[PDB]
Amino acid sequence: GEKQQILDYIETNKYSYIEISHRIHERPELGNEEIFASRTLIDRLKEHDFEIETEIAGHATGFIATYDSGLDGPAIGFLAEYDALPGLGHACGHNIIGTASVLGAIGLKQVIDQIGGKVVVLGCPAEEGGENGSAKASYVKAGVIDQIDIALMIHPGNETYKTIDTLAVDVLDVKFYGKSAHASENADEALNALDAMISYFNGVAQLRQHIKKDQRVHGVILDGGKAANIIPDYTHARFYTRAMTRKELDILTEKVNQIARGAAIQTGCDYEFGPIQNGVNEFIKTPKLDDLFAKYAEEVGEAVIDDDFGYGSTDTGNVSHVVPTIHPHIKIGSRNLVGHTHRFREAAASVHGDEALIKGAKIMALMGLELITNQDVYQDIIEEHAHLK
Amino acid sequence: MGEKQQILDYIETNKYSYIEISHRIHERPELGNEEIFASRTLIDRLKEHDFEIETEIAGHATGFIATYDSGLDGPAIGFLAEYDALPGLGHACGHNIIGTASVLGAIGLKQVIDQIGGKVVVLGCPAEEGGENGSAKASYVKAGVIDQIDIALMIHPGNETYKTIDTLAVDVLDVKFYGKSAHASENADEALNALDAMISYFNGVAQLRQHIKKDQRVHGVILDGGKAANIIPDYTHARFYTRAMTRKELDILTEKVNQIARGAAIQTGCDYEFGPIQNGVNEFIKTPKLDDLFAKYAEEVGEAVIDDDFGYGSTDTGNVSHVVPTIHPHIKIGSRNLVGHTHRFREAAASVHGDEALIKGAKIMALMGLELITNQDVYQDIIEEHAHLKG
Amino acid sequence: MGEKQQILDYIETNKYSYIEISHRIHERPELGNEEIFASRTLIDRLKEHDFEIETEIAGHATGFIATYDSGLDGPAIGFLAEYDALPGLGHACGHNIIGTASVLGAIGLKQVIDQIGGKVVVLGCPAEEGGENGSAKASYVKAGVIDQIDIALMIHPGNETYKTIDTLAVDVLDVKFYGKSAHASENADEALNALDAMISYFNGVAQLRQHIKKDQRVHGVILDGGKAANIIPDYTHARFYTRAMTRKELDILTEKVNQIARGAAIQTGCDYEFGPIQNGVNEFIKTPKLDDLFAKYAEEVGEAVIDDDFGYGSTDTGNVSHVVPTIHPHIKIGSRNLVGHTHRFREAAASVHGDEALIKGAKIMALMGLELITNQDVYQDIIEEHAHLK
Amino acid sequence: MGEKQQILDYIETNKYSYIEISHRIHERPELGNEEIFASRTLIDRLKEHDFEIETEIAGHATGFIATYDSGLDGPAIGFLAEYDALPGLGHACGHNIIGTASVLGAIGLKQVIDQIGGKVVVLGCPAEEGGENGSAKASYVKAGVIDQIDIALMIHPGNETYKTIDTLAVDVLDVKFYGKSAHASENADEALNALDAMISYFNGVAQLRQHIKKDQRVHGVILDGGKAANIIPDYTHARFYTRAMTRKELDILTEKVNQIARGAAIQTGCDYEFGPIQNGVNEFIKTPKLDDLFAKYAEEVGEAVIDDDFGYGSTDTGNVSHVVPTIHPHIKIGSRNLVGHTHRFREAAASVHGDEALIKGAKIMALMGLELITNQDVYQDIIEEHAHLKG
Ligand SMILES: [Zn+2]
Ligand SMILES: [Zn+2]
Ligand SMILES: [Zn+2]
Ligand SMILES: [Zn+2]
Ligand SMILES: [Zn+2]
Ligand SMILES: [Zn+2]
Ligand SMILES: [Zn+2]
Ligand SMILES: [Zn+2]
Ligand SMILES: [Zn+2]
The missing domain is CATH 3.30.70.360 (Alpha-Beta Plaits)
Known part of the structure; x- marks a missing residue:
């Protein structure tokens, strides 16, 4: 019953969120200047009764969206990103990340009243860096990540794969x-x-x-x-x-x-x-949390590839020092897709990119379901992470 | 006999008119190759006294050559006009005075030029402080413009009055x-x-x-x-x-x-x-007989010409001195402690002493031109000395 | 019906004569291009077994080529002799053993060479440690000295026994x-x-x-x-x-x-x-089928050939490997905790274990050359594989 | 006086003895702190004329202080002896002449010292060209050695004769x-x-x-x-x-x-x-009146003291001038075109003109000491000018 509601909501409303994704893609804003993007996402969250704090740890365009059931259970956090690049404008496909994380949060909120616990979206400006860039780095320092117990996210890529180093x-x-x-x-x-x-x-x-x-x-x-x-x-x-x-x-x-x-x-x-x-x-990766990601990546129809996809360089790392975190990729086109290129921006506003958004929202919403529902699978992850850090 | 008196009477009769031009260029400082107001104000005053004007010289839009020819044999006496300010400082080298002094000198000598023969020439020379396509006189020498004059006269406001420096x-x-x-x-x-x-x-x-x-x-x-x-x-x-x-x-x-x-x-x-x-x-390349002539009229006009080490300069007027006998002297506009390119100097360039320097310098130059045209021995001697020192 | 057995009988009956030569070279370390004692001691042993000698090769006074030709058609199997020590450490790479083992291996194969046909050649190769006019084998390649051999064999002492490294x-x-x-x-x-x-x-x-x-x-x-x-x-x-x-x-x-x-x-x-x-x-440029031949005889001679990342070397024997199929394998002379170019290594190049590694290496190389000459299919395959790779 | 004539008669009637000392040092050039032959050859000449010798001064093995004292009140007149050569160049600074001149001057004045009073002192100053533990006179000043003398005299061969340079x-x-x-x-x-x-x-x-x-x-x-x-x-x-x-x-x-x-x-x-x-x-720190005394005697002895810019020097004698009145003049040993630290200068320092300069300088310095001891007003004037000028 619980999985049905989450998927039904995302599937009947997919085009509404896909539309938010192109609306953000058309209006590329650089880090700490993403007023349109943060407002648009804040609105959809507020439309589904989330409690909104704005201006987090010195970031005017950051937010914390919260829906708490008032019952014991883990606070499952979804990282939203929404900053573009100078000259290239969303050639990292950050239109997808923020929308996917919001759609997943709202998908899970549908049943949070029943499973217990809490759902949280953290709006995180300026992941590409710069002056006061890397909002999640600020959040960790400000203690903003004591509000969540698990940090979920997906990034568009050339293939679907687990968190990279x-x-x-x-x-x-x-x-x-x-x-x-x-x-x-x-x-x-x-x-x-x-x-x-x-x-x-x-x-x-x-x-x-x-x-x-x-x-x-x-x-x-x-x-x-x-x-x-x-x-x-x-x-x-x-x-x-x-x-x-x-x-x-x-x-x-x-x-x-x-x-x-x-x-x-x-x-x-x-x-x-x-x-x-x-x-x-x-x-700091939690392999049992990526196992969970792979499981639902596969249940949703993606081939999760095992391969060296290189090293990343993202403030999401900072959040993984505090709580179990993922930074996986969902396929949005050719395996020849390269981040920060013109062909990658085009890919983020394509039908494949739109599908990855919805698949990402489903995957995360269903991981959140299993982490709150299951206490043995949740405890395995929490104890694994605390041992690795 | 009385040709000297006509020059002085003109300059002194309507001196305050020219002091105003100095003050108007001072109020509106313009950088090198951008001196639209300055060039035009100086060009209008020459044109008002029947000078034939050529504009845009050697790739310098704000440059000009203003010529008054008597149509009779004699030297062409050139007057160098400068009129560019400094960034953020705005005429802290006193270039409002230089252009106006040379214009007034030329127009003073112009009064008598139909009687004594020869020719008066003001060369409008922008951007002497340098920069992109700066130093117009360097371009002028290169373009052949200096072939139009036989002698090149100029005065530069300073902390004292002195002959041409190296x-x-x-x-x-x-x-x-x-x-x-x-x-x-x-x-x-x-x-x-x-x-x-x-x-x-x-x-x-x-x-x-x-x-x-x-x-x-x-x-x-x-x-x-x-x-x-x-x-x-x-x-x-x-x-x-x-x-x-x-x-x-x-x-x-x-x-x-x-x-x-x-x-x-x-x-x-x-x-x-x-x-x-x-x-x-x-x-x-200095022509000491030409600086002797300056010092002579500097003293007649009541300046003490100091002989001291006033340092080296660095000006495109040096380029003109490779072609024709040229002076680059200084006229006192205030305290001996005045240093060029300072705020104090800009204020000095608009004082009553700078106004006086302007008039004295125009007088000195007009009177040098009178003698250079008039006294052929004095002219011949300067031309030959310069020719020996370059050649 | 076994020319193999003559080879081993010679090396095994008078091994002590050759172990002496190694200790004599070891007691008297000579820096690159100054190996007067080493080159002469080895040359004298080759002369004793009918080898024809040319000295001063490619501008290297202490270099040589010792040849024994049967006069019959067949491969010319080359053995590389090294004999330079290091300043201050004096044979902490164990070059006393390399040059002795190759000379012993070549004389081991000479005992059979008149019967199986072909040719045995020893290249005295000074100054492999480098320096001014160093890396003798680089000069040999450039001088056309390596046209005189068809295969280049060698063994180096190490912390264990393994195939050629990159x-x-x-x-x-x-x-x-x-x-x-x-x-x-x-x-x-x-x-x-x-x-x-x-x-x-x-x-x-x-x-x-x-x-x-x-x-x-x-x-x-x-x-x-x-x-x-x-x-x-x-x-x-x-x-x-x-x-x-x-x-x-x-x-x-x-x-x-x-x-x-x-x-x-x-x-x-x-x-x-x-x-x-x-x-x-x-x-x-490695010829894996030649390293395979080494490993086969390495195991016949009692050695455990280990397959592991033993790191990169930097030797002029690589220059030879651009011309002909060549090996630069290692033979165990002591603990795995042995490090090259150290005081503990020099002592191991003159130990009982280092002595054993010399005779084992000499046997391995002589038998390899027996097979390269005798087995045309193994020779053809090794020459063709090297040819494809280079 | 009869004293002045004893001095000169000594120096002249056995000048060849000392010229030979100059040549033996020139033949055997020795680097700073390694001048065993030179220091000993000089010390042995001073020993012969009843000078008290102390060897190894201020950490310099080849340094010495040679004192002849009258036991009577009077100035202690110091003669600075140098004797180091240059690597690859031999005595291309003419230091063979310097030390011999100062020893011969000290011994000439010694002839008269028991009659006029005071004291004669020769300081053997190795390594003036510098290097590791070079510049002995720096070490001497620092060690208090210059408290033994009241005036420091010296001559240096040059392309001409002139007063102490800066x-x-x-x-x-x-x-x-x-x-x-x-x-x-x-x-x-x-x-x-x-x-x-x-x-x-x-x-x-x-x-x-x-x-x-x-x-x-x-x-x-x-x-x-x-x-x-x-x-x-x-x-x-x-x-x-x-x-x-x-x-x-x-x-x-x-x-x-x-x-x-x-x-x-x-x-x-x-x-x-x-x-x-x-x-x-x-x-x-120069004492003009001491140089005036040098110039006086230089002229008497046959030299033209030239007033001209001879450049800056760079010598540890300078250190001594901070303590007592000192000279570092030059005496002509050849062409005006002679340059120090060249092969030609080495050649000059063993020439007849170099030998002549040695004797002349010896005479100049001994006659300088005679006046400094004898004339209290000339002495006092020199001491008070140095004291004023050093501060
Ligand atoms: Zn990016
Ligand atoms: Zn990204
Ligand atoms: Zn464990
Ligand atoms: Zn200026
Ligand atoms: Zn100026
Ligand atoms: Zn080695
Ligand atoms: Zn080696
Ligand atoms: Zn010198
Ligand atoms: Zn000197």
């Missing part, structure tokens, strides 16, 4: 501050912020010999001075660093901090060096 | 590197790194400073150093000055900086561009 | 910069700075690392960086390595480093030299 | 980086790279040159930059000069270079050492 990433600004002087007449009175920057860059080049092969550090000079006749008192670069784990990355980023400090000391300058967004973490 | 040679240059972008994490091995090319160029310029002469300079900034942290740059852009005592010495220096760029390109597998954004300023 | 391509390079001196305080404007050129080269090499493949390496030191603080250096000298997975890839990587040097010279107005101080090592 | 302050510094080795192919990630530290220090010094005064210098070389290409270096070693107009300025400059090293260490994770390999050289 993911990497830790920092996005960092480097700034040097000196003292300007006319370069021809009195450069001996200057403290050269550009010499600091060049020296920092020489140092980062040298570092690459001595970091692990899985690690990355790359960046650009955003402000290199403005007048050729005047010694710069300010320069500004932006950098990424990347490691397999947060523990490893914290060590790696401190090495780069020290290259900046050293450059500062060489040149008599002062400096700032720090994150422009809360750091992204590696995924 | 000036330096300058190039202003763009360095651009061109590569092949790639995603930095995933596939940096199929990129050609234009920022690496730039850092290598910068490292090489630093090294070069050990091996250049102590009178030479090389300095610059990175205008484009990449835009996305996750993408390898395929384009970087820097802007540089190079300077030396002479144009001969500078062409050697700039070429060394060229090869530093080239080498950076070779190291990184990138391609490159390296060239001047403007024509290129030359060192002054 | 190896990597290496270049060993000199960078020299040539400028013009002047007094640094007084007239540095008349100088061309060979040290600024060097610093600029090093800065460029650092940048290169972001853009090379993860399996590749470039690393070096400054051997001459100027002598007087008050004189602008007119000369600087660095030594570098470059490494890739193939020789085709390494030629590209080394040329990138060539252009980094070249760019540095252009920046500073200096001149430059950039090139190898030794010929240059190549990736192994 | 001299510069110098530091010779070693830079060492300490890290942690690894196999470069395999384990680079557990290394700390002392060569990257050195490269980074050099890149930093290159950048500094834009920002040091035009009279300042910094230059060095890498003496150890690693030894095996397959191993990340755990040790590098460089040697540097820094230079400035004054010690006050040079300390600021040298500290800037220290911070460049510190920063390189911080970037690479290395440790470091930075410090001088010799006592630092200081700028000359």
